Amino acid sequence: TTPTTPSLSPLSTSINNVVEMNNKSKNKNNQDKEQGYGNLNIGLIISKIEDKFIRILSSDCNSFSRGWRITAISCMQSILSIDNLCGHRSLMFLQNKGFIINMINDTCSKYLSDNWENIDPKDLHVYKSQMSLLLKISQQMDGVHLLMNNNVIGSFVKSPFLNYIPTDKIFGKFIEILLPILQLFASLCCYCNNTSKNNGNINNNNNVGGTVL
Amino acid sequence: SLKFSKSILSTIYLSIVLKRSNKINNNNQNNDNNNEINDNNIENYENEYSNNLVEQFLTTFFIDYNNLFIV
Amino acid sequence: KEEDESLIYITSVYFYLVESLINTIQTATERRLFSSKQILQSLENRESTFKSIFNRQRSSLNQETIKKLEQLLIKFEKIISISKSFKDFRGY
Secondary structure: OOOOOOOOOOOOOOOOOOOOOOOOOOOHHHHHHHHHHHHHHHHHHHOOOHHHHHHHHHHHHHHOOHHHHHHHHHHHHHHHOOHHHOOOHHHHHHHOOOHHHHHHHHHHHHHOOHHHHHOOOOOHHHHHHHHHHHHHHHOOHHHHHHHHOOOHHHHHHOOHHHHOOOOHHHHHHHHHHHHHHHHHHHHOOOOOOOOOOOOOOOOOOOOOOOOOO | OHHHHHHHHHHHHHHHHHHHHHHHHHHHHHHHOOOOOOOHHHHHHHHHHHHHHHHHHHHHHHOOOOOOOOO | OOOHHHHHHHHHHHHHHHHHHHHHOOOHHHHHHHOOHHHHHHHHHHHHHHHHHHHHHOOOOOOOHHHHHHHHHHHHHHHHHHHHHHHHOOOO
C-alpha cells in the first residue's frame, strides 16, 4: 500500500477535558484490519513454504550466474521488507544456514581485497546488491544483533581495501565501494535506543529471550 | 428478505436501547466509586464491537447503488 | 482405558518419556513449550488418573510393586513441578 497521510499534532492542547479517549480505538480497528488482511495473506503463504522457499532462494543467491544472482539477492531484499509479518523467520533461517557470515566472507575476500582496482563493473553490481542486502538486514533489531553476532564491523575493518589512501585517476571507484560500507556501519548504530518502556505488568508469563540491547 | 431486514433492524434497535440504559447506569457508578482473565474486558470488547458494527452497518447503508430509502 | 494394569503401564512409559524430554530441554523457547497449558494439563490429567487407579489398587498390589508406584508418583509430582517452574521462570 501507499503511505497514509501524516497526523498533524496540535501542540497547544494541555488542559483537563475528558471524554474523547474512548472513541479513538474504534476506527483504527478497521484500517489496521484492512491493510492487515492482505499482508497477513502474504505472511500466511510464506509461513507455509519458508523452509523450502528461503532454502531454494539462499542457494540461488550463491549458485546463480552474475545477472540472475542479483535478481535472487533483490528477491531476498524484498522478502526481508515483509519478514516482520512472519516474525523475522527468513532472517533467522539465513543465520540457521550460515548465509550471513558466508555472504560477509564472499564480500570481503572478492571486493575488499588488494585487487579492488581490478573489479569487473558487471560484478560491482553483485557487490552493490550483496551490500544492499546487508543494509536491509541492519534495518531490523534482530538484524543488527545478527550482524554483530557475525563480527560485521571487525570483519570489514580487517580487509585490505580500508588501508588504501585513494588518488585521483580511480577515486570514484573507491567512493563506489566505501559508500555502502559507511551506510552499513551507520545503520548498525540506529536500533540501540528502544530501552525505556519497562512498565512491570507481571500477570502474563511469556519467555522468548529476544535480546533487548 | 424484507421480513428478515425488519427483524434485524428491530433487534438492533432493542440492543442499542438496552446498551443506552446500561451506559447511563455505569456512568453514575463510575463517578461515585472514585473519591475515597479480567472478564471486565469482555464487556469492554463487546461495547466497542457493537458500536463499530452499528457504525459500519450504517455507512454500508448510506455511503449507482440506490439508498434503501429509494428502493 | 479398559484395564487398570495397562493404563498404569502406558502412563508410566509416558512419564519416563517426559523424563527423557526434561533432560533434552535447553532453550528458553523449549521451556516455553513445556510450560504450555496443553502439556501441563495433560501431565496433571495423567498424574490424577494414575493416582486414582493406584489408590483403587493399593489394597490388591504387593508391598514392593506398591513402593515401585509410590516412587513413580513422586517423579510425576516433580515433572509437573518442572512444567510449573519453567512456567514462572517467565515473569522473571
